[PDB]
């Protein structure tokens, strides 16, 4: 039942030292990051997860720079940050899955090159 402020796609060029893929939930209502879980899929496979209960993040080897700002989760921001290299090497559709206790939701954003 988590609602998102949907974004169809985001463009980036080589001048982006840091590439951000937006993910924003509008009905977030947790007061502690322990009850939040975040998962970012790319072409099906998970390329970034955040267990708020364990307070740990996981990334595959080809996505070594993927990270989200945990300070912004309670306010609904689960945007995925990475570097230009991980960006040029991973162009396509990303999925943002956010869990808050029993509630959950997903949104799709395409990463394109200009």
């Amino acid at each position, epitope marked *: *039942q*988590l*609602l998102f402020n949907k974004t169809k796609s985001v463009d980036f060029t080589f001048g982006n030292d840091t590439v951000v893929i937006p993910c924003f939930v509008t*009905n977030m*209502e947790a007061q502690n990051t322990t*009850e939040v879980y975040v*998962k970012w*899929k790319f072409k099906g496979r*998970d390329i970034y997860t955040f267990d708020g*209960a364990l307070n740990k993040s996981t990334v595959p080897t080809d996505f070594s720079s993927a990270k989200i700002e945990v300070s912004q989760l309670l306010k609904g921001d689960a945007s995925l940050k990475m570097d230009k290299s991980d960006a040029v090497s991973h162009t396509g559709n990303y999925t943002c*899955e956010v*869990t808050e*206790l*029993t*509630r*959950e939701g*997903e949104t799709i954003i395409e990463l394109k090159y200009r």
Partner: antibody
Amino acid sequence: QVQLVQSGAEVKKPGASVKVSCKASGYTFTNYNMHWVRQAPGQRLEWMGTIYPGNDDTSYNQKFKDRVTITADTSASTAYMELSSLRSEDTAVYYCARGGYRAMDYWGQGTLVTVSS
Amino acid sequence: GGDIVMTQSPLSLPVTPGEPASISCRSSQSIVYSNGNTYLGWYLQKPGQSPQLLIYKVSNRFSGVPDRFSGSGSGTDFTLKISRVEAEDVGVYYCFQGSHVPYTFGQGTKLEI
């Protein structure tokens, strides 16, 4: 203080219809699903269906196809479950439960529905 | 549209306070949804009360539940574990799956002293 309040118990003759209400309070009604679970006396819990009051998107158990309608009033923070063509196997306690898409957390006190003769 | 057979053993579990307890729940098919999550929940129905949520997503404790209850498992095998049984834990326990419609519960385990 999340609290789900349902209508009073009901007794109906076989073939009639019941409509059980479920008043929600203590949370935002439009950012939570509402589920409806029944339990025949001395049996297991049975999931009947769910609804998302944001766009009245329902998902139903096909066992109750064309018999159950789960509606919602967002301005009243209330959900409803209407079961028609009642038979004897429908005598059960009918619970509403808040929760997400695929799990329930807080339940109502249940509504007893007795199908007589 | 087919029920996923949720089977719980034992059906009855007597135990003295402080002694640990363990309930197993097996499903006919995999509770792994298409997104990789497993939507297996655990519900306690204390006698004379409505059901209440204990564990969601196999292992995640709910808000007010004590640290005694522990959920675990994967695939089709799931286990609920109580480290120290208290006098307020008496009731009927239901495992539940929310991956495949229709959502199906277990048979029920009656906990008692």
